[PDB]
Amino acid sequence: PQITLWKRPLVTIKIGGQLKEALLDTGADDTVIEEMSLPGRWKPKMIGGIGGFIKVRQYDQIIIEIAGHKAIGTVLVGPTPANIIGRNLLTQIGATLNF
């Protein structure tokens, strides 16, 4: 698709067999999702946002579908105000910004 930005670029994702809404975020290095259960072991990570820093759980090699496009990569889980798809997965699905 070609997604304009008059509204927030929200898409449906599928993770763990469940559908969720998430924001396509070119200003995010990483993908961050609200609390949910993911398999395997996690590693610690500190991330920064407009307000300061939060601690998250880093899960690697997670299967995730983004607007119908398959990806497998790192997902951070923590107290984000919104589910965000960052550049680590935007690159996997071939996303570019154009103007």
Q: Which does 73 bind (CB under 5 to 8 A by kind): Cl ion, Na ion, a second copy, none?
A: Cl ion
Burial of 8 (0-12, 13-18, 19+ CB in 10 A): exposed
Shortest spacing between CB 61 and Cl ion, in angstroms: 8
**20 lines the binding site for a second copy (CB under 8 A):** no
**84 lines the binding site for a second copy (CB under 8 A):** yes
> How many beta carbons lie within 10 A of that of residue 30, not counting itself?
19
Does the annotation count 25 as an active-site position?
yes
Rounded Cα gap, residues 19 and 76, in angstroms: 17
Identify which of residues 2 and 41 has a Cβ nearer to a second copy in the complex.
2
Which residues carry out catalysis? 25
